[PDB]
Amino acid sequence: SMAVSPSPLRIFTAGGTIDKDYRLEENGLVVGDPFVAEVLKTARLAGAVSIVALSRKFTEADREAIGRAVGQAVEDHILLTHGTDTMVETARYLGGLPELAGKTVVLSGAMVPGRVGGSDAAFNIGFACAAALMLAPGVYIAMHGKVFDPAKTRMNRGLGRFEPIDDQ
Amino acid sequence: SPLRIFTAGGTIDKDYRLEENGLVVGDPFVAEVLKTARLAGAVSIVALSRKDSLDFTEADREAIGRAVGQAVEDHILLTHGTDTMVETARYLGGLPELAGKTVVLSGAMVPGRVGGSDAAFNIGFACAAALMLAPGVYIAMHGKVFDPAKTRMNRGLGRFEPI
Amino acid sequence: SMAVSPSPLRIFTAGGTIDKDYRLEENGLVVGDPFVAEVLKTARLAGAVSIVALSRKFTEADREAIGRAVGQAVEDHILLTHGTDTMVETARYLGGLPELAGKTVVLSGAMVPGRVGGSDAAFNIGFACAAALMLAPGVYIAMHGKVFDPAKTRMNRGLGRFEPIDDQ
Amino acid sequence: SPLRIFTAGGTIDKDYRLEENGLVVGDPFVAEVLKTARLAGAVSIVALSRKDSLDFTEADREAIGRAVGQAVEDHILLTHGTDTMVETARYLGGLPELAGKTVVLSGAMVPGRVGGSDAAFNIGFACAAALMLAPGVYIAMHGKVFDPAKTRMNRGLGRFEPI
Ligand SMILES: [Cl-]
Ligand SMILES: [Cl-]
């Protein structure tokens, strides 16, 4: 009965801008290795986090595999790192799965790749890990130091941020 | 909810100076992290100290408490050295003046301006904790929330641990 | 007659991978501000270096403007930061201009953008600045910790480096 | 020409350690810069010391001289602390054993592992200097080549300057 640190959070990675990295062959960026693993490596965690790579790019098949992976996890606190362009569509899909009803599921990512100077990625990862641990069960987007309801959120391209959709 | 951030120095903020041939407490690293965070909402940062957290007196903790009480915000982050973080947190937890606020202390084991630092992760985690936790005083480090009354720094592990 | 530090090196910037940076609007890299200025800012220079931006991308017109700028400089030590894909063509062009005959002219750049993690850029800039100051008059490519003769150099794409062309 | 790199410690190599609550001389930063330099040619790196350059004795300088003499390479870079860089350089310049070699000393005013360091620029500049300069001993810092016999560190400027 010595103390055992639990590992209540599992992270799944689905690619996106957060993970982009330069390749000579492409003369540009590709979706690379998961940047969340780099951030957690130096986080001096008390426990650990289980990080599972799902994809590196989006068909209903791809969202369905994500829902299967999230639903089959033993953990009830889940972070999914993802591209911002279809994050709302994935989040809305996950919110329709009854098997997620007792889980806190947070999607996050970055507007700037983690491997590019001046990125929001490390901040967003810390914020989203906490959100996944602390929010009540449901599906959320955590970006810009804010929690978003997927049914009432859109990307504002001129602003470069997600914004809430006001009730009419 | 608007977040108020206070900076009290510590390892997180250390930076190299030629004159000292070593590290000193420099400008608050939380401002560098939040500059690139693309924040959607209400934040402001206030400097309180750059003094060594080992050199904080009961008078210094009383002045930090009064400064946090000056904020009308009910969500507070205080960046601080880890050496006496538990002493400041326990002091703040005893002030009836702060009872409606969520106050989170955080910092870093490695300076933000040194390679391989925990600082940016800790700032994001602690900002969320200050917005989401119920009223009280907490330490947010190591991807965990600690109760100050039941926490110590374990120098053998280089981490806070529960008592 | 107190000591005055000379500024014998002038730098011209013509863009390339070295200067690439992420933009939200593009969802990828563009040619950004000159990365050589960022490196020299923290170099604690004894003197200074004059950095002039020429272009951010290549027509004979573009090479001709570069030759005009280099030939009109008062300095006899010149570094041009440039993309690696046509560096040999620019260098060979400059080597044909008699008005450059007393100048040491070095071209350099980076295989990885300076603003991406793990870049060769800062090393290449320090190496190329020294090369421009120390080599005898002529036109050179300085990359990979090596000096290349433009008439006897090609990019080896499989290798990701310039290589010499052996005499037959 | 093959370059041999020797590492004698100094600010360039400093890194943060929890146990010290500050910087110590860590692993050689020149190895980190050259790992990403995509080098075309012949290089090797040899560790000599992590001892404080202020604490180098005449015996230590004699041992650095003998170590540089063990290299068959005629192009040498020695990374070193700036406090006694001029003393080591002047000592090496007097060794007839080294007369055919180009030996360049360099380092950094800011540790390579601290943000805003001169280290990577200084390493690239000093590698080129070691390949290109005529036989002799030099200091390569601040984008300049210094003659050790005619150089001092000006602590008021934070730069080497000619005498
Ligand atoms: Cl791209
Ligand atoms: Cl220190």
Author numbering:
A (entry chain A), C (entry chain A): 0 to 56, 61 to 171
B (entry chain B), D (entry chain B): 6 to 168
Provide the authors' own sentences about this structure as they appear in the paper.
L‐Asparaginases (ASNases) catalyze the hydrolysis of L‐Asn to L‐Asp and ammonia. In contrast, the chain of ASNase from Rhodospirillum rubrum, reported here and referred to as RrA, consists of only 172 amino acid residues. RrA is homologous to the N‐terminal domain of typical bacterial class 1 ASNases and exhibits millimolar affinity for L‐Asn. Crystal structures of the wild‐type RrA, both with and without bound L‐Asp, as well as structures of several RrA mutants, reveal topologically unique tetramers.
Mutation of Lys158 was anticipated to impede the completion of the catalytic event by preventing the second step of the reaction that would result in hydrolysis of the covalent acyl‐enzyme intermediate (Lubkowski et al., 2020). RrA(K168M) was crystallized in the presence of L‐Asp. However, the density present in the active site could be modeled only by several water molecules. The methionine side chains in the mutated site were modeled with two orientations of unequal occupancy. A water molecule forms a bridge between Lys19 and Thr16 of one protomer, as well as with Tyr21 of another protomer. Similar to the situation found in typical class 1 ASNases, mutation of the catalytic Lys residue (K158M in RrA) completely inactivates the enzyme (Lubkowski et al., 2020; Strzelczyk et al., 2020; Strzelczyk et al., 2023).
